[PDB]
Copies of this chain bind each other. A is one copy, B any other.
Amino acid sequence: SVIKPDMKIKLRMEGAVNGHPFAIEGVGLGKPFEGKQSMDLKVKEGGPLPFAYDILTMAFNRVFAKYPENIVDYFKQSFPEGYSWERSMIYEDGGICNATNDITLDGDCYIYEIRFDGVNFPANGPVMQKRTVKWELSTEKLYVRDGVLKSDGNYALSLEGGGHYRCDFKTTYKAKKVVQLPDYHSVDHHIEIKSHDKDYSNVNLHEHAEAHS
């Protein structure tokens, strides 16, 4: 249809954590049918980031996920007009994050407009002390509530010096035009930071994702 097997990505994020603003821009490319993408991200304002970069990675598009034939693919069907998502992320120690992304399609390139806001991360926590390592494999579960596609999952960040730090994700997905809705299914995400400079002013991020039922 409108989905080429190789696509580009352009994005800008504006946001704040505990009231301190920052902005980040990125360019990437991926292969929506393989469910793989990668991108390079640069801090534009509010650098150097005084918090763990990992709370942002999942905010930096479910079109990049491999769907079998037997599962409805809400995300590929929603283009060219696009879709948006809303998301709340509740960390076990009271830290809470809200994000939105408005996704459009210009040529063979996706354009994200992302807003991100986190509050109540304690000063002695693993986020403000940058003591996180990586996200464990994430299983998102998607379902439909009143004509709207929703998902949630309970995820976990690995911690420096052992242990995990949990977080609960609730996301709402909205196509811009009416689209066929899927049945209950899961999506596994592997997300990883392959490289970065010391202060995370520059970051290279990869993700693989695949749906099941």
Contacts and interface: CB of A to CB of B under 8 A. Distances in A.
Say how many copies of this protein the assembly contains.
Answer: 2
Nearest to A20: B100
Interface in A69-84: 84
Interface in A96-124: 96-100, 102, 115, 117-120, 122-124
Q: Which of A19, A97, A115 has the most CB of B within 10 A?
A: A19
Contacts of A99: 119
Given A19-B84, A146-B124, A119 B94 contact: no
B19 A115 contact: yes
A148 interface: yes
B146 A88 contact: no
Interface residues of A, number: 27
Contacts of A119: 86-88, 98-100, 172
B148 A122 contact: yes
Contact of A117 (B98, B102, B146): B98
Contact of A100 (B19, B84, B122): B19
A170 interface: yes
Contact of A98 (B84, B98, B123, B145): B98
Given A19-B100, A100-B117, A120-B170, 6 more contacts: A16-B100, A19-B86, A98-B98, A117-B117, A122-B148, A123-B146
Interface of A: 16, 18-19, 84, 86-88, 94, 96-100, 102, 115, 117-120, 122-124, 145-146, 148, 170, 172
